[PDB]
Design a protein around this motif. Structure first.
Motif, mmCIF file in Angstrom:
data_model
loop_
_atom_site.group_PDB
_atom_site.id
_atom_site.type_symbol
_atom_site.label_atom_id
_atom_site.label_comp_id
_atom_site.label_asym_id
_atom_site.label_seq_id
_atom_site.Cartn_x
_atom_site.Cartn_y
_atom_site.Cartn_z
ATOM 1 N N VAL A 49 0.824 -1.202 0.000
ATOM 2 C CA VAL A 49 0.000 0.000 0.000
ATOM 3 C C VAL A 49 0.862 1.258 0.000
ATOM 4 O O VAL A 49 1.908 1.307 0.650
ATOM 5 N N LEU A 50 0.419 2.273 -0.733
ATOM 6 C CA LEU A 50 1.150 3.532 -0.817
ATOM 7 C C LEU A 50 0.451 4.623 -0.011
ATOM 8 O O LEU A 50 -0.727 4.503 0.322
ATOM 9 N N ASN A 51 1.186 5.687 0.297
ATOM 10 C CA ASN A 51 0.636 6.799 1.062
ATOM 11 C C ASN A 51 0.947 8.131 0.387
ATOM 12 O O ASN A 51 2.038 8.327 -0.148
ATOM 13 N N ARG A 52 -0.020 9.043 0.416
ATOM 14 C CA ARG A 52 0.150 10.356 -0.196
ATOM 15 C C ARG A 52 1.539 10.915 0.095
ATOM 16 O O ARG A 52 2.108 10.702 1.166
ATOM 17 N N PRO A 53 2.098 11.649 -0.879
ATOM 18 C CA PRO A 53 3.427 12.253 -0.750
ATOM 19 C C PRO A 53 3.447 13.398 0.257
ATOM 20 O O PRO A 53 2.400 13.925 0.634
ATOM 21 N N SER A 54 4.645 13.778 0.690
ATOM 22 C CA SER A 54 4.801 14.859 1.656
ATOM 23 C C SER A 54 3.677 14.833 2.686
ATOM 24 O O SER A 54 3.064 15.860 2.980
ATOM 25 N N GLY A 55 3.410 13.651 3.232
ATOM 26 C CA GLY A 55 2.358 13.512 4.224
ATOM 27 C C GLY A 55 2.905 13.376 5.631
ATOM 28 O O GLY A 55 3.173 14.365 6.315
ATOM 29 N N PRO A 56 3.074 12.126 6.086
ATOM 30 C CA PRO A 56 3.591 11.834 7.426
ATOM 31 C C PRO A 56 5.067 12.191 7.569
ATOM 32 O O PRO A 56 5.942 11.365 7.313
ATOM 33 N N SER A 57 5.335 13.426 7.979
ATOM 34 C CA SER A 57 6.706 13.893 8.153
ATOM 35 C C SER A 57 6.751 15.122 9.055
ATOM 36 O O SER A 57 5.784 15.879 9.141
ATOM 37 N N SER A 58 7.882 15.314 9.727
ATOM 38 C CA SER A 58 8.054 16.448 10.626
ATOM 39 C C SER A 58 9.414 17.107 10.418
ATOM 40 O O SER A 58 10.419 16.427 10.210
ATOM 41 N N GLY A 59 9.437 18.434 10.474
ATOM 42 C CA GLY A 59 10.679 19.163 10.290
ATOM 43 C C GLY A 59 10.454 20.650 10.089
ATOM 44 O O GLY A 59 11.239 21.317 9.417
#
Length: 58
Positions: A48-58
């Protein structure tokens, strides 16, 4: 209570195209063609794939 449904529709031509090309797949065709593709891939491979620039922190 939220109506959450699966599917690679909400995505955008750009997003869908990005992924495809990311995995080394041709981004040729209409939105539908692209959508169906991703669906087939995940179904076959099973990743399964996940939307880009989604789950990330910075």
């Amino acid at each position: 209570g939220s109506s959450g449904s699966s599917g690679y529709g909400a995505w955008a031509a750009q997003e869908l195209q990005a992924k495809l090309a990311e995995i080394g797949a041709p981004i040729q065709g209409n939105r539908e063609e692209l959508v169906e593709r991703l669906q087939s891939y995940t179904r076959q491979t099973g990743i399964v794939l996940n939307r880009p620039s989604g789950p990330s922190s910075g």
